[PDB]
Amino acid sequence: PDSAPGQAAVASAYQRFEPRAYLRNNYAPPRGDLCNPNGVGPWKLRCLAQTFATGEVSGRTLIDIGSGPTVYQLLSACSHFEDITMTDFLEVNRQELGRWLQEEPGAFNWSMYSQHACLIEGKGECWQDKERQLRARVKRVLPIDVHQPQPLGAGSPAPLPADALVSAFCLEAVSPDLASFQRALDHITTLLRPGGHLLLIGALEESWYLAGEARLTVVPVSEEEVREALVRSGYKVRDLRTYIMPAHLQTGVDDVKGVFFAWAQKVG
Amino acid sequence: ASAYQRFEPRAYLRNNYAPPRGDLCNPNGVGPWKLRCLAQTFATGEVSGRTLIDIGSGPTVYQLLSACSHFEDITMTDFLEVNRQELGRWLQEEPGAFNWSMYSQHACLIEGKGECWQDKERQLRARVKRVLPIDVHQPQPLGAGSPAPLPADALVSAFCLEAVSPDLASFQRALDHITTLLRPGGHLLLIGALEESWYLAGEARLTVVPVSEEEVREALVRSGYKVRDLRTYIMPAHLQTGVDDVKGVFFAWAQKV
Numbered sequence: 260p261d262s263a264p265g266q267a268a269v270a271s272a273y274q275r276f277e278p279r280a281y282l283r284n285n286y287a288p289p290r291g292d293l294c295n296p297n298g299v300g301p302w303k304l305r306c307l308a309q310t311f312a313t314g315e316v317s318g319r320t321l322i323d324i325g326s327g328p329t330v331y332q333l334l335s336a337c338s339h340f341e342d343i344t345m346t347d348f349l350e351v352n353r354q355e356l357g358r359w360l361q362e363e364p365g366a367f368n369w370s371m372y373s374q375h376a377c378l379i380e381g382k383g384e385c386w387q388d389k390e391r392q393l394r395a396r397v398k399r400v401l402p403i404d405v406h407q408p409q410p411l412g413a414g415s416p417a418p419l420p421a422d423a424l425v426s427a428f429c430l431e432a433v434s435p436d437l438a439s440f441q442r443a444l445d446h447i448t449t450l451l452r453p454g455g456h457l458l459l460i461g462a463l464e465e466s467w468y469l470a471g472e473a474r475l476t477v478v479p480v481s482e483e484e485v486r487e488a489l490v491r492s493g494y495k496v497r498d499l500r501t502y503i504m505p506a507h508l509q510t511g512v513d514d515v516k517g518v519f520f521a522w523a524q525k526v527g
Numbered sequence: 528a529s530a531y532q533r534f535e536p537r538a539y540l541r542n543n544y545a546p547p548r549g550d551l552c553n554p555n556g557v558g559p560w561k562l563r564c565l566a567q568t569f570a571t572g573e574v575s576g577r578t579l580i581d582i583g584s585g586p587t588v589y590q591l592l593s594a595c596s597h598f599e600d601i602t603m604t605d606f607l608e609v610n611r612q613e614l615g616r617w618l619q620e621e622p623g624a625f626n627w628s629m630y631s632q633h634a635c636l637i638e639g640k641g642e643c644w645q646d647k648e649r650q651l652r653a654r655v656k657r658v659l660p661i662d663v664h665q666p667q668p669l670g671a672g673s674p675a676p677l678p679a680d681a682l683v684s685a686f687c688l689e690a691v692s693p694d695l696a697s698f699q700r701a702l703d704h705i706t707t708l709l710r711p712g713g714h715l716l717l718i719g720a721l722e723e724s725w726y727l728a729g730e731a732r733l734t735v736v737p738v739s740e741e742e743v744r745e746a747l748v749r750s751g752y753k754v755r756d757l758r759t760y761i762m763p764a765h766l767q768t769g770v771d772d773v774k775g776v777f778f779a780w781a782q783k784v
């Protein structure tokens with residue numbers, strides 16, 4: 260059928276996306292409490308840390324797809340990639356990342372995430388060093404639209420193809436349905452070299468979340484749907500794990516039921 | 528001694544626990560070295576019990592970071608009221624407290640139990656039952672009817688004895704004095720300046736007895752200790768700051784036998 264109408268709804272909805280509210284809802288406590296090892300924050304960081312710890316995910320260039328105003332997803336990654344591209348649809352998110360890169364006080368504070376990353380990576384690294392490295396390795400912050408066949412546009416800055424991709428809570432949150440999801444997955448997969456790796460994190464069985472005024476629509480997906488989409492896009496699934504959101508982390512900022520983390524290698 | 532009546536806790540903290548000496552990023556620094564001696568010792572699981580006393584705490588808490596998870600009853604001490612007030616400010620999370628969070632974080636980092644620094648500080652604050660006045664120069668340093676559970680299962684002291692003793696003999700006696708507080712079989716963890724003769728604390732200028740590693744060893748033996756571990760950290764040039772003339776730092780793990 261027609262993809263344009265659905266995409267236009269999404270783009271419209273995100274014009275009301277408020278980065279601060281979003282940061283507060285997802286990365287401040289209770290969800291942003293990293294003290295409980297059973298929490299979602301620690302689980303995510305652990306998936307990322309353990310994956311990079313295999314040494315199997317490395318190279319020169321990495322691209323973060325739909326970064327938003329967050330950086331936690333790149334904390335463990337930055338030690339393995341000299342060149343990191345961050346990306347987002349919204350200018351206001353790109354600016355938010357701009358505040359953090361300039362180490363402004365106005366910026367969101369990721370230090371609890373940085374510290375927790377250093378802690379689980381087990382190298383005795385101090386968080387200030389972790390943060391300094393990330394800031395050094397982010398070579399550009401780019402506009403992106405995963406719905407376009409060339410999500411970064413034509414003749415764009417990013418070194419292509421990238422050795423690896425990271426994406427957290429993007430696809431399912433900008434895709435009106437499973438078919439749009441699959442197409443978005445196919446588009447970003449063009450940015451990854453063959454043999455490259457994708458690290459994918461997202462909400463399971465979610466239909467909405469709040470970002471200030473904006474109550475945005477999410478395509479509820481299942482683990483098996485995520486798995487099939489990855490296979491469909493030409494990936495071997497190396498790892499796919501599920502975190503079940505505990506009742507007390509269900510706070511009415513969304514209707515998420517769980518979080519998935521996928522490690523996939525693009526067949527080449 | 529009367530010199531300690533000019534001792535400024537904020538200036539002391541600033542001089543020794545703010546950068547450069549307070550920068551914990553470089554693993555080769557003295558801060559990380561100290562935390563490591565503490566951490567590694569307790570990790571052995573051989574230094575355990577219910578009660579512990581920190582001798583001459585001053586306005587600092589780093590020395591108990593790893594210790595607090597092995598002892599449910601912790602007593603902190605210092606000769607100066609101003610230091611006891613400063614500790615309380617951090618213990619009660621009052622305003623103007625010193626920020627020990629960099630130290631808490633590195634303790635968690637070093638211990639490697641994936642503990643968050645807020646939990647660490649929470650546990651310490653919880654287990655410190657009391658902050659008592661003390662004079663190591665007295666044969667009963669805590670006094671007659673001290674609220675402190677005696678004898679203690681273990682003792683900790685950092686940069687005290689050598690810093691309040693005019694000379695080696697005085698040093699030795701102060702060690703004998705505190706040793707009476709320690710249950711036989713108990714453990715003492717002792718940290719201090721090596722070959723130091725003075726250090727500043729704002730308007731106060733304190734005299735120190737310059738001691739060597741083997742001098743410390745001998746003193747522990749004489750006091751009735753078996754020396755389990757004794758290590759030295761040589762002070763790098765960039766950590767020589769004009770606030771003292773320390774040459775090194777020692778760590779001793781001693782068991783009362």
Ligand SMILES: Nc1ncnc2c1ncn2[C@@H]1O[C@H](CSCC[C@H](N)C(=O)O)[C@@H](O)[C@H]1O
Nearest residue numbers: 325326327329348349403404405427428433
């Ligand atoms: N068409 C599109 N293509 C790529 N990203 C889009 C997009 N439309 C919206 N987005 C972005 O999708 C993001 C989802 S929120 C996820 C933020 C971040 N990655 C984290 O892990 O929390 C928002 O930043 C939003 O601006």
Ligand SMILES: Nc1ncnc2c1ncn2[C@@H]1O[C@H](CSCC[C@H](N)C(=O)O)[C@@H](O)[C@H]1O
Nearest residue numbers: 583584585587606607662663685686687691
């Ligand atoms: N007669 C005495 N008996 C016990 N402590 C004394 C003392 N005279 C001075 N002190 C204290 O000894 C401390 C030395 S500085 C050490 C402070 C802290 N333990 C640290 O590791 O940094 C000061 O706090 C000082 O007030």
Ligand SMILES: Nc1nc2cccc(O)c2[nH]1
Nearest residue numbers: 285290299428462515518
């Ligand atoms: N965007 C986003 N949605 C989430 C749902 C659960 C936990 C998280 O950290 C999330 N981040």
Ligand SMILES: Nc1nc2cccc(O)c2[nH]1
Nearest residue numbers: 543548557686720773776
């Ligand atoms: N009192 C005191 N605390 C110290 C910490 C590190 C190095 C030193 O020389 C110190 N002296």
